[PDB]
Amino acid sequence: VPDYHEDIHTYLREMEVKCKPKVGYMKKQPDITNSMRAILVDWLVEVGEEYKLQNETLHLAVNYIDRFLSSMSVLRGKLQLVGTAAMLLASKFEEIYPPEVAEFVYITDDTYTKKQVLRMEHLVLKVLTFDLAAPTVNQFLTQYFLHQQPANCKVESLAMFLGELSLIDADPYLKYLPSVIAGAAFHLALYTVTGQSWPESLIRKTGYTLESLKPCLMDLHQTYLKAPQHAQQSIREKYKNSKYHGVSLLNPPETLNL
Amino acid sequence: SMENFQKVEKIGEGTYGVVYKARNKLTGEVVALKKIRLDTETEGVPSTAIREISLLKELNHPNIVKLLDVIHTENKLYLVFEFLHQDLKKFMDASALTGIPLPLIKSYLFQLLQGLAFCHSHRVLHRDLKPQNLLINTEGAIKLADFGLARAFGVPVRTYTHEVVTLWYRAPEILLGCKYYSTAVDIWSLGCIFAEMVTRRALFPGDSEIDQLFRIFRTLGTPDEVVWPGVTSMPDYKPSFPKWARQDFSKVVPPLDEDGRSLLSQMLHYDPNKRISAKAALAHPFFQDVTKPVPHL
Numbered sequence: 093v094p095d096y097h098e099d100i101h102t103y104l105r106e107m108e109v110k111c112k113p114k115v116g117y118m119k120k121q122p123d124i125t126n127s128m129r130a131i132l133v134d135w136l137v138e139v140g141e142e143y144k145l146q147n148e149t150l151h152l153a154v155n156y157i158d159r160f161l162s163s164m165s166v167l168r169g170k171l172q173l174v175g176t177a178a179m180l181l182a183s184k185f186e187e188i189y190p191p192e193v194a195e196f197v198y199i200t201d202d203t204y205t206k207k208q209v210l211r212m213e214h215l216v217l218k219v220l221t222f223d224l225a226a227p228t229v230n231q232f233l234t235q236y237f238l239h240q241q242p243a244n245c246k247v248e249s250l251a252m253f254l255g256e257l258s259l260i261d262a263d264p265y266l267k268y269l270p271s272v273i274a275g276a277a278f279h280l281a282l283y284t285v286t287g288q289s290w291p292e293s294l295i296r297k298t299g300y301t302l303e304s305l306k307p308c309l310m311d312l313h314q315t316y317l318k319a320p321q322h323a324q325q326s327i328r329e330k331y332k333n334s335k336y337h338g339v340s341l342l343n344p345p346e347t348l349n350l
Numbered sequence: 351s352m353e354n355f356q357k358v359e360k361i362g363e364g365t366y367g368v369v370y371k372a373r374n375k376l377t378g379e380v381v382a383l384k385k386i387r388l389d390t391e392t393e394g395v396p397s398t399a400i401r402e403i404s405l406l407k408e409l410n411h412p413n414i415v416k417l418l419d420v421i422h423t424e425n426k427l428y429l430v431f432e433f434l435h436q437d438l439k440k441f442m443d444a445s446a447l448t449g450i451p452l453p454l455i456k457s458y459l460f461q462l463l464q465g466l467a468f469c470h471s472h473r474v475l476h477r478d479l480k481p482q483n484l485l486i487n488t489e490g491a492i493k494l495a496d497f498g499l500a501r502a503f504g505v506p507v508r509t510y511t512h513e514v515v516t517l518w519y520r521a522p523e524i525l526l527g528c529k530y531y532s533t534a535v536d537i538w539s540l541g542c543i544f545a546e547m548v549t550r551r552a553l554f555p556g557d558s559e560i561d562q563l564f565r566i567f568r569t570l571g572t573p574d575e576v577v578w579p580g581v582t583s584m585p586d587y588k589p590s591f592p593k594w595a596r597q598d599f600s601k602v603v604p605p606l607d608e609d610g611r612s613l614l615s616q617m618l619h620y621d622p623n624k625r626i627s628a629k630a631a632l633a634h635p636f637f638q639d640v641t642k643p644v645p646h647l
């Protein structure tokens with residue numbers, strides 16, 4: 093903690109490079125697409141809300157899926173099995189009270205069996221070689237939040253929202269590290285709510301400037317603008333909740349003025 | 351998979367795992383094998399094993415018992431650990447007539463603080479430091495073991511499992527059910543262990559949460575808003591708690607010198623925020639002359 097803030101930040105920066113999925117992996121998957129991946133993650137978002145899981149669990153589960161799919165070629169009828177095993181693994185890693193396995197079996201409306209989920213759980217662990225302590229956008233965001241002059245709960249919730257949105261679209265977002273997406277999401281959230289900008293103190297912490305974040309920020313800005321029009325809407329619905337200060341109802345800026 | 355290992359004897363046991371001393375037939379290396387039982391028709395791989403393994407592969411440090419390998423099987427999970435000859439409690443039970451010499455205590459403390467500062471700077475809480483989980487070899491190394499209860503923490507932490515740390519080594523913020531606890535809980539446990547190394551008896555041997563709390567209060571004084579801002583706001587704080595006066599610290603652990611007492615008092619600070627960090631404690635004058643004395647077993 094605050095004796096280790098910087099040690100931890102440094103270490104997460106080295107680990108996010110190690111745990112990065114391969115950018116081009118969907119090209120290499122014969123039977124699945126970005127679009128099918130989007131469907132899975134959006135379902136996982138609903139599972140998350142149905143079981144009241146941490147946002148961290150969600151971010152980990154997606155990290156496991158992207159890494160699993162970086163090395164293992166998967167049929168469309170099995171994508172949701174991978175996703176269930178990932179989310180179960182994520183919950184055991186991160187939740188105080190993980191849902192029991194039967195609850196994971198149940199949420200896949202009798203598509204698969206308990207024995208299948210548990211064998212997939214095993215295969216996932218083998219494929220990831222047990223490297224479950226992956227850094228996520230969530231873990232960086234939470235650190236960046238400490239640099240708000242007045243802490244603003246709307247900035248925080250909106251940052252998480254934009255962070256979550258970027259989980260859905262592999263196309264652009266797989267090319268950016270969690271620390272860079274978080275940077276872009278924090279600045280975009282700051283700007284939208286308060287008119288403020290990526291704070292100088294985060295430049296000294298991360299070494300990132302508005303200039304270095306710009307590419308991701310260009311993509312995230314568009315994703316924000318087009319959010320109500322996306323085929324997948326579970327995140328928008330999720331962040332309508334008072335628990336997240338209804339930040340998905342806030343209006344995006346039309347320009348970033350960069 | 352297990353064909354290169356040769357079990358020598360059963361050595362200990364957990365809730366899922368049985369631990370054997372074993373030997374690598376090809377390299378000759380003596381290792382500890384933790385056999386973890388797996389059930390298909392239940393819950394799968396236990397979360398304790400999921401955390402112990404993933405956290406332990408990140409923690410390579412001379413004072414953290416090293417996970418050498420994980421051996422799979424559709425039925426079983428075998429963890430291969432570096433082997434150490436005993437735990438700290440057994441060493442203390444066998445030092446029970448003469449005591450542990452101060453050079454050795456200083457060396458052990460300094461090594462533990464190193465392992466602990468390595469965990470915290472890698473965002474890991476151990477959450478079960480007690481002398482049974484601290485293994486010692488014949489070279490005078492001591493190392494942290496059993497990461498079964500550990501967890502990866504986030505930077506402002508959030509609320510984690512409350513049911514945490516063996517009672518005697520459990521910190522007051524956990525006892526008072528704070529919303530948030532952090533690295534300071536491990537330091538509290540090491541404080542207790544530091545005291546226990548000196549006298550060879552537990553510092554706060556309670557029987558319940560309230561009993562544990564009252565034993566702490568009677569030794570360190572009952573905390574008020576002065577010593578610990580927010581204490582009276584804690585979820586399990588009660589205004590009816592007896593008010594004990596803080597004792598002379600030289601009576602808490604009589605054989606300790608000024609530096610030791612100073613260091614111990616920083617590890618047993620009520621307020622998690624002022625309690626010393628493992629990192630900061632490495633530079634304490636208590637350790638100005640630390641050697642690594644290699645005991646006599």
Ligand SMILES: CN[C@@H]1C[C@H]2O[C@@](C)([C@@H]1OC)n1c3ccccc3c3c4c(c5c6ccccc6n2c5c31)C(=O)N[C@@H]4O
Binds near residue numbers: 381415431432485
């Ligand atoms: C004092 N308590 C037990 C003593 C005995 O078994 C236990 C279960 C406990 O040791 C921490 N145990 C573990 C539990 C979980 C993970 C690792 C270990 C482990 C290792 C060892 C030993 C050990 C060596 C010599 C005598 C008893 C021992 N015990 C253990 C271990 C070891 O050498 N390396 C492991 O990390």
